[PDB]
Amino acid sequence: QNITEEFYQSTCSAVSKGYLSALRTGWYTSVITIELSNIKENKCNGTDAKVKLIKQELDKYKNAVTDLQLLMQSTPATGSGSAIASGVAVCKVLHLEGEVNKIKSALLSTNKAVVSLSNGPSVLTSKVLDLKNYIDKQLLPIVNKQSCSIPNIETVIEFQQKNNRLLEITREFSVNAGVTTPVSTYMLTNSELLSLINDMPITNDQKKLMSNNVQIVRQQSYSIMCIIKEEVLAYVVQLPLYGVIDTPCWKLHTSPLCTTNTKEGSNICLTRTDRGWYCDNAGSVSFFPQAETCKVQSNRVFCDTMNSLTLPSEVNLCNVDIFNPKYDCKIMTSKTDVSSSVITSLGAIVSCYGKTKCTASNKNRGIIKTFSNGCDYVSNKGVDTVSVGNTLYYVNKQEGKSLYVKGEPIINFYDPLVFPSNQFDASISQVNEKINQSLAFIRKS
Amino acid sequence: QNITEEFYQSTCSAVSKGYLSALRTGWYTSVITIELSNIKENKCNGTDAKVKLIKQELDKYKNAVTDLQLLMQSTPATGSGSAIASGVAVCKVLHLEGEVNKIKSALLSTNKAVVSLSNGPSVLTSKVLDLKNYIDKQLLPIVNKQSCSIPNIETVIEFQQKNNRLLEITREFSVNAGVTTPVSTYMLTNSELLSLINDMPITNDQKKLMSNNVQIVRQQSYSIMCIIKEEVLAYVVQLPLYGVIDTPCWKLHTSPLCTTNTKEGSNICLTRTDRGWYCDNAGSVSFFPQAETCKVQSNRVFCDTMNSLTLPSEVNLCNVDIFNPKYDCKIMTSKTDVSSSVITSLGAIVSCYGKTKCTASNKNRGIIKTFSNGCDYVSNKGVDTVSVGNTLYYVNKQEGKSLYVKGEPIINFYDPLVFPSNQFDASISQVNEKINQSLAFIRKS
Amino acid sequence: QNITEEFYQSTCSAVSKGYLSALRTGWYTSVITIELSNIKENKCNGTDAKVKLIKQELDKYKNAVTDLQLLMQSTPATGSGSAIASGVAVCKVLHLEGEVNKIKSALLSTNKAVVSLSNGPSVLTSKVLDLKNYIDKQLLPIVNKQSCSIPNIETVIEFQQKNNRLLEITREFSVNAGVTTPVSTYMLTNSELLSLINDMPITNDQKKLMSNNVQIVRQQSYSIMCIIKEEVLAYVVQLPLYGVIDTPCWKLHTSPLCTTNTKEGSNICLTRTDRGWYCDNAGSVSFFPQAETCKVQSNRVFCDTMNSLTLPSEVNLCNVDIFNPKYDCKIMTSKTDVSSSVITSLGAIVSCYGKTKCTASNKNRGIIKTFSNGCDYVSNKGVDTVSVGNTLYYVNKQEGKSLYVKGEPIINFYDPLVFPSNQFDASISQVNEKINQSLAFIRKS
Ligand SMILES: *[C@@H]1O[C@H](CO)[C@@H](O)[C@H](O)[C@H]1NC(C)=O
Ligand SMILES: *[C@@H]1O[C@H](CO)[C@@H](O)[C@H](O)[C@H]1NC(C)=O
Ligand SMILES: *[C@@H]1O[C@H](CO)[C@@H](O)[C@H](O)[C@H]1NC(C)=O
């Protein structure tokens, strides 16, 4: 895939093109079970050091079970649960009489199995750990007699290893109120995640997509605690379904565009708004304003449509003609001429004002470009760093072509006296209407 | 408890009522000690594999102690320490001569004990781990001779288990500069937290409150590292005291309210401000603007009054009459007609504008409601999802009654030509004064 | 070092002086290697419990290696990688043919060694764990025969201890997409960090600085995963270089300054902007607007110049004469008279308006000061807490001198009718120009 960039000198903005999308649009919920042992404390006259170690690890198991019990009594309403609703609906089904018994029956002979619930949905269940078999077969003959039988040291170690995953899951669920994200390897192993991806009702190319970006899949997944009941600990893992694939995505970068007059206080500034990620989606454009809502791998963007706005496709015309009537291209105005830089995908935008020392250097050649007052841009081809004031930015060394689109900075088309200088989220046409109304008070005079 | 909702069509806002409060107003500090062993490295000609394992775990203990020492030399001033002041004041007392010796004496025979410090306060101390007894009784006869005695394999395992909590506490305190929140099970066990709640000078009903929401108590607690001195590692756990209980709490939801003219650029928008949590508190209302400052369980809100504003009780009249002179009901204005949705507690607000496809569906029936241009609302009774553009929101399936309060959208009472379209944090009466002043420039003409 | 404060009654702002700087200006990258064992699964008829435990831990090692392999295929472009560029450039060199073989040769006999790469830079390499020697010497004679040899129980335990660090590093790198910050003790031990500081090409006083603030150094460091290839797991640790040292730093605190008229809706408010940390840097001032970008220890501020603005040194004149023409001192305006408090370094600013109950108390004396309507200040000398409405703030008990600089609140110099009441990021002179233009519409009438 070819990554390209376009800096528009007229609007002090740059667009990084050539990225492919992966937008989350659905959820695939799955039930994860850990078969537990319903045991009560048993006392046999014991003093052997091995017996002591076993009883110690067994108390750590019983506290973990009671901790999971007090965790499942309190079921969280933290937030709008608008992104976990899919799994919360499964937990409400699991609380029905006979349903934990149902999953207990389907996973009686195999580890994984599809189960048709009574509410309806066809969930895929897994048995990832079997403590009921281990405690009842290897541990009860040790503690459930008049006098304790003596266990071998291999057993002490094997029980600390098996019980460890239960303890770590109780630790995470206790500090996070039953909802964890990302989903850790304790909640779901890479082997278990990959087998769960392979068993999903998705296309073969989409299974390849999730398997090559398992870390992004974990960051976009949730683990919700359901119930501990009748020797079963169940929790739902909610994995992302990417309904939008291989669509064009671009990233808009904006920087303040001011005039460069020599008398401070006589300068006016304009900045394009809505910087961030844009992706073509179902005849429209899905816009992502928060910076942390999109993880990028290679040329592919992984966004959650949960935190997007839906805009008309004409919003891209702000990149080719900011003055085009098909779309009201919004700006913000000020008189705050502070220098800054934006590291883009293939270069750097620099807004230099005042006495600020703006420059672009190569590690071995030194300063190769000095920016003047105004908004400018430099490609990463031959540039390693950019210094603005006392701050040094590193340029991304990604391969791609940059295009410098020359044009008059549009801030020069504005008369300063009638400029609206405190506008946040203003349209180009809105600013023009405030200027036409301010021109009428002068028309009479 | 009955959860109810009221959508006000006139102001594009909804109020979720019936929630009970738990506001944090005080702190209960407590001293947590780990009795350590003042040992220096001891060398005996040793090569036995068991002796090697013991010396390895002992070096991990000595590095943990030196790591805690370099952690306590640097005492943080990170932030205004305005919420840890209560515990920082105890750490300054612990540094006095004889005070670590005092706690060392009170916990000489029992694990928990109340101690009257020299500064004054009556703190409750605990001994959660005893490494001085274990290292000096089970380990020194092994390393403090000419030739090492041979330890049994149970001892190697018991020492890795006991030393583990010390190592994990040093790990958390090293990456977090001595202040951790929430308070982990390593800092304080659920058994230790529950016993600490039971031993607190609080009402019996309030102990029941903290014991049923231990995960929320952990998220609202702090663990502060004090000192390692004279075979004692001490750190203060600061637990929340909820001075406001069972008060009425409601959640205000707001969404943009625009006109629906057919020519873009001729539309004006209004949005109610100060969305969030409101709770009755001491004759006033405690308002919480940040979303993460309130954890909800069932019908109970758990807020920290540290991040609240105090407002007059007349602020609720913005919910019944936005035009009421007893309180200046604030709005923000714009010309940005972008579609969005808000998932409320019992339904969903939808602001639909332009060509956006807004709809509300049931999983098995399909589309059951199409929203028109404007601000509207749908209850969760029969609705599962709401789609706005390319985004799908899930509706909370919580039981409750919704009330649709019909009324003319107030944005229609405004003449567009004289509307103030860039107002952030503006009052209703403030906007009316800008309109009366803009009406005077037209009165003469 | 003497900490001092100055509250300016005229502008409702306070300045905390006497702090020394440590600004991050460079990066020191270092290569961290873990020598691994290229083994494939080996099967010998085995049933001994010790053999089973060893094969279990060996599968956990092989899954960790395959997990690191799928982690290094996906190389992240998450963000602008503008702060990890230095290490990402080293990872691209490590991928060259013969370079992992080069580091494998330089660390063949010693643990640490400086290596001149082919790209150029002179990196310092370390071998922190040696699994190739341990697996090939202690484990292969156990699994690579016709029938398995029987290992001793000390070996089972020693292998779970050595393999543990590899597993924890794979766990962190899997959930964080190869880039972790802060740098944990698993990524780099305190002993390894301190030895790495001692071996750095920095001044001896600067090594003392980083060694006494290792927790701040970890919070300002990055760990980047490079490659697993040819029995080598390599990742770069990027440590901060503090180019600005012992410079003057002050903290600006601002609070709303309103008029105290008795009729609500007739009041105007002004607040100084750009609150935060200021440090002298290279003839200018480095300003830090985000609150979490500066960690404070004692009297020293540790900032990253990556998130700073560079301002002229005349910006300090807003603290002595807000009306001074050398610098355009910016304010924001509103009519939102909401009470609040700011805990400063040596006292507290209180903006009290309306019916709000503002007070300052001592724990044992009770209320010692009642604030009137307006903006006021109290030193921490004799004050423990400050209550504003239903909120109680704790005052920092740091030793220092406070100075109350009396002056007329400048909001009283403004005629309310012509005040600009919706100004964000406005200069003093900008507001005066809007008043001169609004005075001309009245001049004719
Ligand atoms: C300003 O007036 C001119 C006509 O004189 C018109 O072409 C233009 O569209 C107007 N702009 C706005 C924003 O109303
Ligand atoms: C506008 O003027 C009318 C009187 O003509 C008055 O009733 C109203 O309160 C005024 N509004 C403001 C905000 O001053
Ligand atoms: C306002 O006018 C006076 C002269 O009458 C001048 O001294 C002052 O600088 C002007 N202020 C601005 C902001 O233009």
Please write down the HEC assignment for all residues of chain B: CCCEEEEECCCCEEEEEEEEEEEECEEEEEEEEEECCCCCCCCCCCCCHHHHHHHHHHHHHHHHHHHHHHHHHCCECCCCCCCCHHHHHHHHHHCCCCHHHHHHHHCCCCCEEEEECCCCCEEEEEEEEEHHHHHHHHHHHHHCCCCCCCCCHHHHHHHHHHHHHHHHHHHHHHHCCCEECCCCCCCCCHHHHHHHHHCCCCCHHHHHHHHHCHHHHHHCCEEEEEEECCCEEEEEEEEEECCEEEEEEEEEEECCEECCCCCCCCCCEEEECCCEEEEEECCEEEEECCHHHEEEECCEEEEEHHHCEEECHHHHHHHHCCCCCCCCCEEEEECCCCCEEEECCCEEEEEECCCCCEEEEECCCEEEEECCCEEEEEECCCCCEEEECCEEEECCCCCCEEEEECCCCHHHHCCCCCCCCCCCCEEHHHHHHHHHHHHHHHHCC
Q: Which ligand is nearest to the CA of B323?
A: 2
Q: Report how far apart, in Å, the C-alpha atoms of A240 and of each of A112, A243, A389, B392, C66 are.
A: 20, 9, 43, 13, 23
Residue A120 neighbours by CB under 8 Å, 6+ apart: none
- Give me the resolution in angstroms, 1 decimal: 2.7
**CA separation for the pair C344, C276 (Å, rounded):** 11
- How buried is B388 (Cβ within 10 angstroms: 0-12 exposed, 13-18 middle, 19+ buried)? buried
- DSSP at C314: G
> How far is Cα B246 from Cα B18, in angstroms, rounded to an integer?
10
- Whether B167 and B267 map to the same domain: the answer is no
Whether the CA torsion C418, C424, C428, C432 is positive or negative: it is: negative
Distance CA C196, CA C188 (A): 10
Helices and strands per DSSP (H, E), number in chain C: 11, 26
Task: Find out whether C13 and C255 touch, Cβ atoms under 8 Å.
Answer: yes
User: How many Å is the Cα radius of gyration of chain B?
Assistant: 30
How far C442 CA sits from the closest chain A CA (Å)? Answer: 13
How far, in Å, CA of B277 to CA of C14, rounded? 31
Q: How far apart are CA C13 and CA C176, in angstroms?
A: 41
Instruction: Identify the residue among A171, A188, A215 best suited for mutation to test binding to C, counting C beta carbons within 10 A and taking the highest.
Output: A215
Contacts of B75 in chain C (CB under 8 A): 298
Does residue C173 contact residue C225 with C-beta atoms inside 8 Å? yes
Structure-token pair, residue A146: 């008049």
**Tell me, what DSSP letter sits at residue C246?**
E
Q: How far is the CA of C365 from the centre of ligand 3 (A)?
A: 52
Dihedrals phi, psi of A255, to nearest 5 degrees: -150, 150
- Measured distance CA(B422)–CA(B434) in Å, rounded: 12
Residues B262 and B173 in one domain: no
Q: C49-73 vs C153-175: helix axis angle to the nearest 10? A: 20
A with B: how many residue pairs have Cβ under 8 Å apart?
138
User: Rounded to an integer, what distance in angstroms lies between the CA atom of residue C253 and that of residue C250?
Assistant: 10
Q: Write b or e for each residue in A376-390: b if 16 or more Cβ atoms lie within 10 A of its Cβ, otherwise e.
A: bbbbbeebbbbbbbb
Q: Are residues C72 and C206 in the same domain?
A: yes
Q: For A107, phi and psi rounded to 5 degrees?
A: -95, 35
Q: Are C32 and C234 in contact (CB under 8 A)?
A: yes
> What is the rounded radius of gyration, in angstroms, for the C-alpha atoms of chain C?
30
Instruction: Indicate if A55 and A119 belong to the same structural domain.
Output: yes
The preferred substitution site among B428, B429, B432 for testing ligand 2, maximizing ligand atoms within 8 Å of CB, is B432
**Which residues, numbered 8 to 27 in chain A, qualify as contacts with chain C under a Cβ-Cβ cut-off of 8 Å?**
none
- Residues C205 and C287 grouped into a single domain: no
- The owner of tokens 């909804």 is B14
Q: Can you list the positions of beta strands (E) in C159-256?
A: 179-180, 222-228, 232-241, 244-254
Element at A316 (helix H, strand E): none
Query: Is there a contact between B310 and C190 if contact means CB atoms under 8 Å apart?
Result: no
Helix, strand, coil share (%) of chain C residues, nearest 5: 30, 35, 35
Residue B101's alpha-carbon distances to B75, B115, B431, C11, C80, in angstroms, are: 21, 12, 66, 50, 53
Nearest to C10 by CA among C435, C326, C377: C377
Is residue A340 less than 8 Å (CB to CB) from chain C? yes
Cis, bond preceding A182 (omega within 30 deg of 0): yes
Closest CA to B295 of B181, B425, B178, B177: B181
Say whether B53 and C157 touch across the interface (CB within 8 A): yes
CA distances from A357 to A351, B295, C24, C282 (A): 11, 47, 19, 11
Residues C237 and C255 in one domain: no
**CA C8–ligand 2 middle distance (angstroms):** 37
The one-letter code for the residue type at A389 is: G
Pairing of strands B26-35, B122-130: parallel
Burial label for A340, CB within 10 Å (0-12, 13-18, 19+), is: buried
Q: CA C402 to CA C404: how far, in whole Å?
A: 7
Per the DSSP assignment, residues forming a β-bridge with A377 are A349
* Contact between residue B120 and residue B246 where contact means Cβ atoms under 8 Å apart: no
- The letter for the amino acid at A45 is N
CA distance linking residue B401 with residue B5, whole number of Å: 6
Contact B122/C at CB under 8 A: no
In this structure, the answer to whether residues B290 and B332 fall within a common structural domain is yes
The residues, ordered by sequence, that sit 6+ positions from B202 with a Cβ below 8 Å of its Cβ are B28, B210, B241
Domain boundary among A218, A241, A264: A241
- B47 interface with C at CB cutoff 8 Å: no
Contact B255, B271 (CB under 8 A): yes
How far from A210 is each of A191, A194, A301, B179, C134, CA to CA, in Å?
13, 8, 13, 38, 35
Q: What is the DSSP letter of C138?
A: I
Report the distance separating Cα A381 and Cα A400, nearest Å.
9
CA–CA distances in Å: residue B159 to residues A60, B93, C219: 16, 32, 31
A353: enclosing H helix or E strand: none
Q: Is the CB of C429 under 6 A from ligand 3?
A: yes
| Residue written as token pair 């543990």 | C164
Are B390 and A305 a contacting pair, CB within 8 Å?
Answer: yes
Please give the Cα distance from A230 to A239 (Å, whole number).
27
Structure tokens at A93: 């089904």
Number of Cβ within a 10 Å radius of residue A255:
23
CB atoms within 10 A of CB A117: 17
Closest by CA to A195, choosing from A110, A85, A104, is A110
What b/e readout covers A411-426, taking b as 16+ CB neighbours within 10 angstroms? beebeeeebbbbbbbb
Of the residues B186, B218, B241, which one is the last residue of a structural domain? B241
Whose CA is closest to B47, among C154, C54, A49?
Answer: C154
Please give the Cα distance from C234 to C92 (Å, whole number).
12
Decide: helix, strand or coil at residue C152.
Answer: coil
Distances in whole angstroms, Cα of residue C252 to Cα of each of B47, C10, C312, C319, C349: 62, 15, 16, 9, 12
- Shared domain for B95 and B152, answered yes or no, is yes
Question: Distance from B104 to chain C by nearest Cα, in Å?
Answer: 27
**What pairing do the DSSP bridges indicate for beta strands A13-24 and A300-304?**
parallel
Nearest residue (by CA) to ligand 3, atom 4, is C436
DSSP 8-class letter at A76: B
Q: Number of folded domains in chain A?
A: 2
Q: Name the helix (H) or strand (E) containing A288.
A: strand A284-288
Which one of C436, C438, C439 would you pick to mutate in the ligand 3 pocket, going by the greatest count of ligand atoms within 8 A of its CB?
A: C436
Contact call for residues A269 and A256 (beta carbons, < 8 A):
yes
User: Measured from the CA of A265, which atom of ligand 3 is nearest?
Assistant: 13
Instruction: Give the dihedral of Cα atoms A49, A50, A54, A59; nearest 10 deg.
Output: 0
Closest-CA distance of chain C to residue B363, Å: 33
Q: Which chains touch A (3 or more CB pairs under 8 A)?
A: B, C
Query: CA-CA distance, A23 to A281, in Å (whole number)?
Result: 9
Q: Would you call A263 helix, strand, or coil by DSSP? A: coil
Residue with tokens 């031993």: B199
- Can you tell me the distance from the alpha carbon of B412 to that of B267, in angstroms, rounded to the nearest whole number? 10
Determination approach: X-ray
Does B422 sit within 8 Å of C422, measured CB to CB?
A: yes
Backbone angles phi, psi at B299, to 5 degrees: -110, 5
Tokens of residue A257, six digits: 């565009």
Q: Does B215 touch chain A (CB under 8 A)?
A: yes
In B, minimum Cα distance to A65 occurs at: B190
- B180 with B284, same domain? no
Q: Which residue of B has its CA nearest to C393?
A: B82
Which ligand is nearest to the Cα of residue A436, counting in written order? 1
Q: Which ligand is nearest to the CA of B263?
A: 1
What whole-number distance in Å separates Cα of residue A74 and Cα of residue B296? 10
* Sequence-ordered list of residues with C-beta below 8 angstroms from that of A11, at least 6 positions apart, any chain: A257, A272, A322, A407, A409, A410
Distance from CA of A382 to the nearest CA of B (A): 38
Residue of the nearest CA to atom 14 in ligand 3?
C433
Residue C418 to residue B224: CA distance in whole angstroms: 52
| Residue B297, min C-alpha distance to chain C (Å) | 23
Per the CB < 8 A criterion, the answer to whether C46 and C52 are in contact is yes
Which helix H or strand E contains C302, and what residues bound it?
strand C300-304
Rounded Cα distance between B28 and B86, Å, is: 8
Give the whole-angstrom CA distance, residue A431 versus residue B335.
11
Our answer on whether the CB atom of B437 is closer than 6 Å to any ligand 2 atom is: no
Q: What is the distance between the alpha carbons of residues B315 and B285, in angstroms, rounded to a whole number?
A: 8
Q: Domain limits at C67?
A: 26-241
Q: Considering C241, C276, C297, which residue would you say is the last residue of a domain?
A: C241
Considering the domain architecture, whether residues B116 and B191 belong to the same structural domain is answered as yes
DSSP 8-state assignment for residue A369: E
- What number of C-beta contacts closer than 8 Å exist between A and C? 138
Same domain membership, residue B414 and residue B427? yes
- Which ligand is located closest to the Cα atom of residue A335? 3
- Which residues fall within 8 angstroms of residue A128, CB to CB, at 6 or more apart? A32, A33, A34, A111, A188, A189, A192
* Whole-number Å distance between alpha carbons of C390 and C122: 59
d(CA B66, CA B76): 18
| Same domain, residue pair A225 and A126 | yes
For residue A291, what is the DSSP state? G
